[PDB]
């Protein structure tokens, strides 16, 4: 089984949408078109020495196509997302990732360009760069599995999916000023591999806005 | 089996002191600007309520404030004073705060005020949800904290001979709580 | 008797309290009311009234009759606007003094739509076109007629209709804005065409400007800041 | 959408202080005619209520008066005094006003009087609409102001050894308001 | 607080086999959670400074 | 397909009960509770140099739980068994085992502790220890495939199952004195593996009495 998903002028090859977590059980919904497509970010290399990676949302897509154009040329907007993490590796690599979606992921070691990496995303550290096992804020990472999450354990699966509804104190809000979601991908178990295998496996993120809607155009 | 005491209402709605506001009598000797006390309502000071609220991201709650006033003469001197009255003024969000003892805010119709007579039942009000947003944000990943209001306190009696200090304990009890989006709880470390 | 238990809050006077109270004149037959014209049941009924915007708050113009008139003249056709009015009805010195602003100063929060109404007070003969633009919140106001035309606008014809009622919408992240500080939009009037006149008719006309809340407008959380 | 807080009742019916009436104890030392305090009920003093009422031309409203009495000994001397009682007499329109402490008006059956015992709940009455006209005129373009009444105040205890000053805050709350014929509101300038 | 309650414990039944030069040092993680039958009572906040 | 079998306070993960030989076609049967659970023995390491292994039954379970307690505190008893041999290896190992169940497996190079190894089992040799290709008694091992058997050929399968009914000249007999079955696991083909793979793969036995019944308790 190999599903070939499509959104407009974009196509993605998912092994299967078997493990697809919906954050807090709520599917994205409008308030009771073209921007909502697959935007695949620049891959990051997971090595033995990695501590983690993190992107914000909608900050990650501030430059991507219409979801960037609209996100600037409007004032207010809301959007759910579909973060698809593909971590294609061999059968002779081993490790685990924890993909955690975090509402209002306020990081701490704080000045807009600092907490808004954009497309490339930031990285954690193990002692700016926030701490890996803390997620910046003093917070034991074990308890981090409260958040909407999924485990990419290479021995069994090599891709996760996260459907994220719009989560904010407001019905609609300015996307330029204020992020809603924060994706953090941290290695629960370290990478390891056979003798001379590819020593750094790639992690790819495919973000797809869902129920993207904005007001008011200038 | 029963999960009532682990309900949000039972876990949160519990009378917790959040400040101790000290005010002196308007004695005409050398008294400083300690004649009145002002405290912006904020949970970020008491660790118990804060650590319980930072389990969760968003929130909504009415806020029952009880006021326990306790006075005493300062000097060993032969102290005498008729029963004091205390103006406990709640200042809603976005409103001006008192600067002086005889500022106009103590005569403003907007600002609701309690007139507690010393030696009686503790004063009380019930602030409703006063958020512009549809939920109190405990964590906000954006650029330009939430305003609950201010509590100001003074003695109403003016030309008093003997000094009288007084502490107003504020027992805040959140009522009708709702909380969304749980989070890992912080350690007690940075509090 | 009935055993009671005096709770906290007893013997306190909360100025916001609403209890019954004993009448000092209980045998007194009140003068009955009559049907006077003009009963106001709500304060927003006073903010729904088109009151005149003072555009020129300069040192001389202010506190006179000239502070309201916007003078259209014949001078080099500069792309800059005749007027640019920020939509901070409370935090704009021009709209702050209108009736709307006087009612908003009594409140903290507000939400709804405004209707602006410009009015040509020139000659029956004069003809021309103005362009009434509305930049939405967050936008930096239009500096040239082209930038304004591309956005929302109304090509008002001075020759045909003597007024122009543009209605602003309710755009805010919160359900309610504040009455103090941060944007909210800009009305702005440009010449599309320099005003034509016939014979020795004066080439200096005036436009007035009115503002009023709409039926969707509402305020809350009273905040009186009046003192001496 | 909701326009409740901008209703006339919500906009006006808010407890606002309108005076502070000071009275001394009938001490037999050298006391002047400060033994009693008299204040004609009028909104033309407090700017908040006045500026809100002068939005409109005519009006009708009951008038709930609350009284917050706060006393204190004047002298640093070893002050002692049993609990004072205060006669708070409302004088209707067209009635005579007290001239002396022991005038007859304090014994008149007409004039309703409260006997407030110090150190208890604030006193209160509810004056009804006392207008000869069917509406209070805030502006009258004619030739010959409206009478609401008078509030007089005294201490009832008479042969007191130690002087005791006392301030009576009058918190007027108009209730059941109706207003007609709106007007432009005055600037804060001439107030 | 204080007295027993049991012990989870993990042993090797068989030393872990691997194919070719694959690493012979793996990791196991461990998770815990209450069940639907779980309940608590008598709140006791011990948080202070 | 991964079946997770259970017997009381014991659970076993079988890949599939596809190849499950019933010895002589007869399922275990009572004479016309708690002791009957999974007892998993200490694993044995199959190397390149192995000749074989063997256990007896019920001797192997003389110390295991209730099937040992009862087996001693009674005088007479009968029991069928379910010997499950799991020989988990990689895909880069190769070899074959012959699991043979042998009624009255009288061994020969003979003194009770000698012919009753118990839990650990004995081993064969290639020249005490009985001979591998003989099964102690002079007996060509090829013809050993007469016995109730199954071949664990690592290229296709890596576990066998053997259901063993009670086989004795008597209806019921003393388990302390006299074994009924003898399991012998012999490498038909030798182990071999790629370069630096795990050089000794583990063989695990899970014995499960069936229709265990005893008389008379002391």
UniProtKB/Swiss-Prot annotation, chains A, F:
Location(s), subcellular: Virion; Host cytoplasm
Outcome, altering residue 149 to G/T: Complete loss of VP0 cleavage
Quaternary structure (record): Interacts with capsid protein VP1 and capsid protein VP3 in the mature capsid.
Function: Forms an icosahedral capsid of pseudo T=3 symmetry with capsid proteins VP1 and VP3. The capsid is 300 Angstroms in diameter, composed of 60 copies of each capsid protein and enclosing the viral positive strand RNA genome.
Record-given protein name: Capsid protein VP2
Species annotation: Poliovirus type 1 (strain Mahoney)
Residues shown, of full length: 81 to 333 of 2209
């Amino acid at each position: 089984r190999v599903l070939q998903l499509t959104l407009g002028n974009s196509t993605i090859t998912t092994q299967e949408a078997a493990n697809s977590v919906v954050a807090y059980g709520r599917w994205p919904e409008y308030l009771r078109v073209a921007a909502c497509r697959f935007y695949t970010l620049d891959t990051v290399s997971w090595t033995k020495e990695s501590r983690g990676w993190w992107w914000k949302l909608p900050d990650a897509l501030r430059d991507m196509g219409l979801f960037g154009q609209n996100m600037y040329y409007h004032y207010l907007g809301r959007s759910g997302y579909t973060v698809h993490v593909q971590c294609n590796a061999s059968k002779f690599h081993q490790g685990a990732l924890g993909v955690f979606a975090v509402p209002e992921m306020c990081l701490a070691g704080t000045s807009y360009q600092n907490a808004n990496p954009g497309e490339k995303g930031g990285t954690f550290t193990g002692t700016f760069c926030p701490v890996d096992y803390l997620l910046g804020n003093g917070t034991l990472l074990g308890n981090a599995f409260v958040f909407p999450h999924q485990i990419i354990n290479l021995r069994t699966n090599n891709c996760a999916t996260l459907v994220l509804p719009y989560v904010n104190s407001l019905s609609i809000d300015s996307m330029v000023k204020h992020n809603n979601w924060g994706i953090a991908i941290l290695p629960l178990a370290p990478l390891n591999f056979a003798s001379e295998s590819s020593p750094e496996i790639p992690i790819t993120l495919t973000i797809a806005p869902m129920c993207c809607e904005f007001n008011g155009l200038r | 089996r029963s999960r009532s005491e682990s309900s949000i209402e039972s876990f949160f709605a519990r009378g917790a002191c959040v400040t101790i506001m000290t005010v002196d009598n308007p004695a005409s000797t050398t008294n400083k600007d300690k004649l009145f006390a002002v405290w912006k309502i904020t949970y970020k000071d008491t660790v118990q309520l804060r650590r319980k609220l930072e389990f969760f991201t968003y929130s909504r709650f009415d806020m029952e404030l009880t006021f326990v006033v306790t006075a005493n003469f300062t000097e060993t001197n032969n102290g005498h004073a008729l029963n004091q009255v205390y103006q406990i003024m709640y200042v809603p969000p976005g409103a001006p705060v008192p600067e002086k003892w005889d500022d106009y805010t103590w005569q403003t119709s907007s600002n609701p005020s309690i007139f507690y007579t010393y030696g009686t039942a503790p004063a009380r009000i019930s602030v409703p949800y006063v958020g512009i947003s549809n939920a109190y944000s405990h964590f906000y990943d954006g650029f330009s904290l939430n305003d609950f209001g201010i509590l100001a306190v003074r003695v109403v009696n003016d030309h008093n001979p003997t000094k009288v200090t007084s502490k107003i304990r504020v027992y805040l009890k959140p009522k009708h709580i709702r909380v969304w989006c749980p989070r890992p709880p912080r350690a007690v470390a940075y509090y | 008797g009935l055993p009671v238990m005096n709770t906290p809050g007893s013997n306190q006077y909360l100025t916001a309290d609403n209890f019954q109270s004993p009448c000092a004149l209980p045998e007194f037959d009140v003068t009955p009311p009559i049907d006077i014209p003009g009963e106001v049941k709500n304060m927003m009924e006073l903010a729904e009234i088109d009151t005149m915007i003072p555009f020129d708050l300069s040192a001389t113009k202010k506190n006179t009759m000239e502070m309201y008139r916007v003078r259209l003249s014949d001078k080099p056709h500069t792309d800059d606007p005749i007027l640019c009015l920020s939509l901070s009805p409370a935090s704009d010195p021009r709209l702050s003094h209108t009736m709307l602003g006087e009612i908003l100063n009594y409140y903290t929060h507000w939400a709804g739509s405004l209707k602006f109404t410009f009015l040509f007070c020139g000659s029956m003969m004069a003809t021309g076109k103005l362009l009434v633009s509305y930049a939405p919140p967050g936008a930096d106001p239009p500096k040239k007629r082209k930038e304004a035309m591309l956005g929302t606008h109304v090509i008002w014809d001075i020759g045909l209709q003597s007024s122009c009622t543009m209605v602003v919408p309710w755009i805010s992240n919160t359900t309610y804005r504040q009455t103090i500080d941060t944007e909210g939009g800009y009305i702005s009037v440009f010449y599309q065409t320099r005003i034509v006149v016939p014979l020795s008719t004066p080439r200096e006309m005036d436009i007035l400007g009115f503002v009023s809340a709409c039926n969707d407008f509402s305020v809350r959380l009273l905040r009186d800041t009046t003192h001496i």
